[PDB]
């Protein structure tokens, strides 16, 4: 009773000239290829000790996608993509206890094109310490999803926000979180 | 900023049914969110999904050794990549971390893998099928899952069944 | 083991 799906997902986007290459396993990222550093980036560090991937093959695919995009743009008579604003959800990794280490998760879902600005706001002010984020993850509807993380010690005097900017949004979207 | 965007997507999909016994391979090309051409291992050749992929389907199917290559992808690509990561993907097991606590107007299951899980409320010694409020399966994006299953209603026991454990996990309150 | 990328095909012109 082993039913699984492995997807190699690639995209290239003009005129931003940004592409990505990743492997998906049942909705989780196995790895992606950092185009700038030409390196295989495993979602979990332990994966790199068990398997390997020559990142150069990903750069070759992205180049083909770039050349194919210019052709497909001509076939459609330069029909652009329609913006789709994202759904944004903020949650925690584990139940919240005072002064007990935890991490906030900002989940961005059902959006295209894959270009977003994300900012964590602590008491309305930006915070950039220890934050991490994932690459754009594929969806079955061929939109995208994305995960942002913010570790934090929960306190009654601290209030957090996840500010997301997208071209499909008429104004910046802001999702709120605070301790009861 | 105001200038329009254009997106090309490619998805090479391997669908596994009962391990590597039954495998379906899909080579999919997209313009924006529209699939314009596709190779289906059940079909055996490239087919245009829309009129946009009609040139590619005709061109690719005519290439030397193309049909032979793509018909072998279930073995050379799907079944191979399945075995490369089997030990830390298909066989990955992380047991759940269960905490039971009440709230003012809750069985919290956190950090488990895979996503298939089964949780029940017992109160007491007989499972309670009424008043169950389940948040559903939530993917954390870090190869872990979590879920909140609430009950508003004595010994309370939350019973969690997960493929990482050989027997049910019970937490009382 | 080594993951095998499926190569992207050049579109018809």
């Amino acid at each position, epitope marked *: 009773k082993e039913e699984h799906v492995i997807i190699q997902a690639e995209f290239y986007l003009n005129p931003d000239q940004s592409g990505e290459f990743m492997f998906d396993f049942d909705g989780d990222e196995i790895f992606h290829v950092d185009m700038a550093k030409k390196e295989t980036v495993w979602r979990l560090e332990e994966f790199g000790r068990f398997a390997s991937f020559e990142a150069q093959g990903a750069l070759a695919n992205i180049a083909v996608d770039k050349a194919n995009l210019e052709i497909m743009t001509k076939r459609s008579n330069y029909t652009p993509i329609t913006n789709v604003p994202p759904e944004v959800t903020v949650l925690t990794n584990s139940p919240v206890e005072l002064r007990e280490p935890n991490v906030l998760i900002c989940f961005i879902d059902k959006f295209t094109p894959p270009v977003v600005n994300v900012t964590w706001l602590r008491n309305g002010k930006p915070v950039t310490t220890g934050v991490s984020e994932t690459v754009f993850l594929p969806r079955e509807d061929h939109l995208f999803r994305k995960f942002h993380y913010l570790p934090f010690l929960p306190s009654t005097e601290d209030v957090y926000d996840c500010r997301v900017e997208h071209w499909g949004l008429d104004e910046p979207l802001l999702k709120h979180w605070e301790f009861d | 900023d105001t200038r329009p965007r254009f997106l090309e997507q490619v998805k090479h999909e391997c669908h596994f049914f009962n391990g590597t016994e039954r495998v379906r391979f899909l080579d999919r090309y997209f313009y924006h969110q529209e699939e314009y051409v596709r190779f289906d291992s059940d079909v055996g050749e490239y087919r245009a999904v829309t009129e946009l992929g009609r040139p590619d389907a005709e061109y690719w199917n005519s290439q030397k050794d193309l049909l032979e290559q793509k018909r072998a992808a279930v073995d050379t690509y799907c079944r191979h990549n399945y075995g490369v990561g089997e030990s830390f993907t298909v066989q990955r097991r992380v047991y759940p971390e269960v905490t039971v606590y009440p709230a003012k107007t809750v069985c919290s299951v956190n950090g488990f893998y895979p996503g298939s899980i089964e949780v029940r409320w017992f109160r007491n010694g007989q499972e309670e099928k009424t008043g169950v409020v389940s948040t559903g399966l939530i993917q954390n994006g870090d190869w872990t899952f979590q879920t909140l299953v609430m009950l508003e209603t004595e010994v309370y026991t939350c019973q969690v069944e997960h493929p990482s454990l050989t027997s049910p996990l019970t937490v009382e309150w | 083991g080594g993951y095998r990328a499926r*190569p992207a095909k050049a579109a018809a012109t």
Partner: T-cell receptor, first 114, second 113 residues
């Protein structure tokens, strides 16, 4: 990384059995693809046969080669060589984890004598 | 088919030579291989869709060129005596290692002092 095959010229009478040895060094490439290419006199290089699955054997034109995992070999055999088999035979491999890059052996010149 | 030119060429050390190749198989990937005097076959370049993907420590004397998927040309800027060899053009469906390579007839180069 390296392919070693029978060196130099081999002379065989027609209808005799033939073996052309080929071994590969399983060093950095964990799972190679194995090929035999043939160049008939006055012609260009072309594939004789290949095996891309460890364990299986490939066959063409009465020739036969087994991708032997344990022996790390890909020996080429034929039960009865014909005079038209006279050619140069190349054993080759490619790393199955990256771009196609054929690593050729030194080549074996076969002369089938009537 | 895989066509390449010229079939033979003699030139003096320090001169410039240009080889041209074409394949009609509809393939994305094309190669240049060198067959030296000992008849050892070694890859030089691999191009996929007009982009270099493999360069086996080839001296900068060699300048491959591809403005089209079916074409792969090679220019040696200032030939040296060790460049005397047979240069083989090849193509494959894509850069997947399982693919069969289809070779041309070869360009026989003789560089003389």
């Amino acid at each position: 990384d390296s392919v070693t095959q029978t060196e130099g010229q081999v002379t065989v009478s027609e209808s005799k059995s033939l073996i052309i040895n080929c071994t590969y060094s399983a060093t950095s490439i964990a799972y190679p693809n194995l090929f035999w290419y043939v160049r008939y006199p006055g012609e260009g290089l072309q594939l004789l046969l290949k095996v891309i699955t460890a364990g299986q054997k490939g066959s063409s034109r009465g020739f036969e080669a087994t991708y032997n995992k344990e022996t790390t070999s890909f020996h080429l055999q034929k039960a009865s060589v014909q005079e038209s088999d006279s050619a140069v035979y190349y054993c080759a491999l490619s790393d199955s984890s990256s771009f196609s890059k054929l690593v050729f052996g030194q080549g074996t010149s076969l002369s089938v004598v009537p | 088919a895989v066509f390449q030119t010229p079939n033979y060429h003699v030139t003096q050390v320090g001169n410039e030579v240009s080889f041209n190749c074409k394949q009609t198989l509809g393939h994305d990937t094309m190669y240049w291989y060198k067959q030296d005097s000992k008849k050892l076959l070694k890859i030089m370049f691999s191009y996929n869709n007009k982009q270099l993907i493999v360069n086996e420590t080839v001296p900068r004397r060699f300048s491959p060129q591809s403005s089209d998927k079916a074409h792969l040309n090679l220019r040696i800027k200032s030939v040296e005596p060790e460049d005397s060899a047979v240069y083989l053009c090849a193509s494959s469906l894509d850069w997947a290692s399982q693919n069969t390579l289809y070779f041309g007839a070869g360009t026989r180069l003789s560089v003389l002092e």
